[PDB]
Design an enzyme around this catalytic site. Structure first.
Site, PDB file in Angstrom:
ATOM      1  N   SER A 292       1.818  21.873  25.518  1.00 12.95           N
ATOM      2  CA  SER A 292       1.755  23.315  25.702  1.00 12.95           C
ATOM      3  C   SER A 292       2.166  23.717  27.114  1.00 12.95           C
ATOM      4  O   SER A 292       1.902  23.011  28.089  1.00 12.95           O
ATOM      5  CB  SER A 292       0.345  23.824  25.414  1.00 12.95           C
TER       6      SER A 292
ATOM      7  N   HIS B 149      -6.547  28.258  26.036  1.00 10.79           N
ATOM      8  CA  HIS B 149      -7.292  27.227  25.323  1.00 10.79           C
ATOM      9  C   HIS B 149      -7.213  25.852  25.973  1.00 10.79           C
ATOM     10  O   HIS B 149      -7.914  24.938  25.527  1.00 10.79           O
ATOM     11  CB  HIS B 149      -6.800  27.126  23.878  1.00 10.79           C
TER      12      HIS B 149
ATOM     13  N   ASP C 241      -4.589  34.931  24.121  1.00 10.11           N
ATOM     14  CA  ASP C 241      -4.735  33.558  24.616  1.00 10.11           C
ATOM     15  C   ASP C 241      -3.951  33.336  25.910  1.00 10.11           C
ATOM     16  O   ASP C 241      -3.235  32.345  26.069  1.00 10.11           O
ATOM     17  CB  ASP C 241      -4.317  32.540  23.552  1.00 10.11           C
TER      18      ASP C 241
END
Lengths: 151, 48, 47
Positions: free
Chosen positions: A103, A29, A51
């Site tokens: 992230s 993402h 993901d």
């Protein structure tokens, strides 16, 4: 320590990628391009069920690869911003640490072996519920608590 | 003429056999391929 | 003319579905760090 690389887009840092084992790992993402021009030439394959995107590590950088394991004994673990607790099947970190754009950070074992890659988290009263992508023998699994938001 | 005209369903016995074999053969290929997709889809659903 | 067109399209669907199944079958085995694809699946089915 040296396995962390930055991802930038339109002049801002969005997130991180990590090199573990023999593979390049990046959350799906996160937008942008990789800072190292050498990695930018690789072809990446995508699967939205986890993901996760991965590609093969080139030969000349093999010395920078981290070590890994699969064992998950109960106890305490460390990462960039402090300490994290693993108990009852979930990772909990005290509230206030972490923010959008963090992230891709790894979580380390006592001897420096990598056990998890973190993405997102959920807001509770005094603790934070983390969403993590782990692996097991011959497979990978995704753990996601209720109410989590993307980071 | 002293007889009526014929319709679309009137076809010789030899011609009908060739139509059946061709349509049946192609149908089997779709049928076998369909089953493999269903088996794989269930494994992904349950394992996660 | 019409019958030939429809029959050819049906054959193409059967091939198209097979490639879709193979992709989903294998992908879990390649993202795992340090994983090895089993012998039976590597060679014969879900190549």
């Amino acid at each position: 320590n040296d396995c962390i690389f930055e991802v930038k887009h339109e002049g801002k840092v969005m997130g991180y990628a990590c090199l573990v084992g023999d593979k390049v790992m990046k959350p799906a993402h996160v937008k942008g391009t990789i800072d190292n021009a050498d990695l930018a030439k690789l072809a990446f394959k995508r699967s939205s069920k986890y993901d996760l995107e991965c590609a093969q590590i080139p030969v000349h950088m093999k010395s920078d690869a981290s070590k890994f394991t699969h064992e998950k004994p109960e106890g305490y673990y460390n990462w960039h911003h402090g300490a994290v607790q693993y108990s009852g099947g979930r990772f909990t970190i005290p509230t206030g640490a972490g923010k959008p754009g963090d992230s891709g950070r790894p979580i380390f074992d006592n001897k420096g072996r990598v056990v998890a890659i973190v993405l997102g988290g959920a807001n509770e009263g005094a603790r934070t519920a983390l969403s993590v992508v782990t692996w097991n023998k011959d497979i990978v699994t995704k753990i996601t608590p209720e109410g989590a938001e993307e980071w | 003429a002293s007889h009526t005209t014929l319709g679309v369903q009137d076809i010789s016995t030899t011609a009908m056999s060739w139509v059946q074999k061709i349509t049946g053969g192609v149908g089997l290929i779709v049928a076998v391929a369909a089953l493999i997709l269903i088996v794989v889809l269930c494994v992904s659903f349950s394992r996660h | 003319s019409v019958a030939s067109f429809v029959l050819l399209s049906m054959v193409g669907t059967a091939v198209g579905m097979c490639v879709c199944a193979r992709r989903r079958c294998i992908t879990p085995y390649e993202l795992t760090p340090g994983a090895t694809v089993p012998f039976l699946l590597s060679l014969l089915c879900c190549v």
